[PDB]
Amino acid sequence: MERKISRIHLVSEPSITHFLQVSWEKTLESGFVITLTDGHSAWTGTVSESEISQEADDMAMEKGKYVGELRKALLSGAGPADVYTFNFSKESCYFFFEKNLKDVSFRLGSFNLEKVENPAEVIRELICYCLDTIAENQAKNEHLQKENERLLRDWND
Amino acid sequence: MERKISRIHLVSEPSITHFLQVSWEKTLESGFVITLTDGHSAWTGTVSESEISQEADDMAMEKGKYVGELRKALLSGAGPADVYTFNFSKESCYFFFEKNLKDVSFRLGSFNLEKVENPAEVIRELICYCLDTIAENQAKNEHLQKENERLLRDWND
Amino acid sequence: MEELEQGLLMQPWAWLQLAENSLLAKVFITKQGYALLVSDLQQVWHEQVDTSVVSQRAKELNKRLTAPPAAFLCHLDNLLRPLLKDAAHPSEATFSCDCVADALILRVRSELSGLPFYWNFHCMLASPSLVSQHLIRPLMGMSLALQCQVRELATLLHMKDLEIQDYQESGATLIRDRLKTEPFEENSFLEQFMIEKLPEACSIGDGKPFVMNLQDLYMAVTTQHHH
Amino acid sequence: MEELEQGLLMQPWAWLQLAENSLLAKVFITKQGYALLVSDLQQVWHEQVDTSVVSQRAKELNKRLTAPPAAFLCHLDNLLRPLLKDAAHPSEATFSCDCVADALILRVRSELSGLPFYWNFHCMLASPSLVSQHLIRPLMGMSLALQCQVRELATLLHMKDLEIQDYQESGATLIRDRLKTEPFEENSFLEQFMIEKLPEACSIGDGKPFVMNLQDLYMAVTTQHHH
To answer: What does altering residue 82 to E do (chains A, B)?
Structure first.
């Protein structure tokens, strides 16, 4: 059970920064949960494995090739050459994103999100996850720092 | 300019988790900013170098010794032997914490916090910071991971 | 309230080191309060406190006191028993003394669980009745009992001479002639003791010798005197 | 005026028998006046008088007093030295005691050369400084010095055992076998002393034992303490 939290900018609000949280189970391909938050409200949606495969067909892309595009666009592992745009309507809760080429852009995906009843709970859990991540990383950085020092010595003598 | 974000539990809400964010400039001793949030609202306060030294006197503690206690209580660098308690009244915005000894406890500090006008902005900045931290740490963990691999090889051959 | 005073009479004297001075002190702490007696070998000071006084004074001395009197009393007991019983044990306390006319204020500055702790003993001149019960009467009792010991050792020494004279009376010769003891005569033993040994032996000093060589006899005399 | 107090410190304690009570008392009389100290083993009373006081009080007490204070003081000294030094000597005096709150009034009724004589000692509670100088400090010094005696006698006893063992080691036989002493062991000597002898040995009583067995040591300690 994995997750990625990315920061994004919506066309309808280039001023404010929003956060996108994507969570899945051992591949995006098998389906995923997406959450959008502005630090006050939160909108959630689910994408089934079937929906993914269907979207890949409607776009005329090989399934795996399509999932690759989703990784770069949703998990903020986008290249300099890969420019993505995100749109959201608080009125319809419709979320969609496009890939931007030279003065032309194309719909890459779309989701009907649902406004969450307990945003605070969601925000708190997200922040909690971030802090745990910061913690796990520090521990590992320390364990690797010592192993680095041990090898430096073991090499010398 | 440093900061620490800790997760805490208030006496008046043991159910919910709150977050404490403390920020300062090259020692708590010179003053700091504290922010409390529940993921919906946020309360902030400033503590001047003068107030710190004053608190250290009212308590009858050596200034440096007092700042040491604050580090353990506010920056979640508390020992298993150091048990801290936090209280907050949403009605007065008064925040105070105590250190718990064998069946006795003593007021360690108190702040008059102010309810923030733009909580979302504050929450968004906090999450932004967490993500940057996670990013910086992951990069370093990778650089050290490769250096660990290089040394492993260099040792063998 | 009488219980505190009763338990105080059975306590031995401890030795304490202060700012410039040393003090002799005995103390009895319970859940009810405390009774303390202090002496600098010139004057004697006393204080008896109850639970009401404890709460008021602790709140005034430690501004963020959130503790029942009983716990504060237990901390004072736990802080002072190791420090007194052996004046070389490292208990986290530091003492200062202030003399306001006939009153003595004993100040304690300590650290419990990394938190500072303050307590002041407010001692008035001890009533003559307590000076008699805690010092004079027991001290006088000790002197009489020690004098009986001296007497019993002298009889024991005279008994061993009767034995040595039985060897000298008979066909008994000493091998190492550097072992010969002079026959014991109390009159001359006292005369040499009073000129040669008394000067340093009767020096009360800071009361340390008293606390180091006599507290066992002190506790035995007090218990005896009190039935 | 300080001379009286100084001479008082060197005086030993005497035993006196009164109306229903007995008192311990020491006194120093000169042509300048007197200093007196009295104790019932519960409180301590003091009085220092000068020549002016003597004249006034003697006139009021003995309505046909035609004498300088000096002579009156000398008569008090000559009347009280034999009576104190030996509490069984028949001096023509009789005593009574009145306790007015904190004060003690010691009344004397005597007859000198077939003429009646009256004197009242007006004693206030002794200051703590005097109680320390005249009782506490010397009594504490005596206990220490007695404890040194015990120690020196125990070493003497162990030295005599090394000698007896040297006879047993060699060609030495005892004639009267009822003379053999048990080797001296201080630990067991104290244990038997504390159970078997301490109860009566430390009985202060009316202070008579203190005045009868310890005054010599008391005077030696006071002289020592005062250089």
So the answer is: In SSMED; impaired ability to repair DNA double-strand breaks
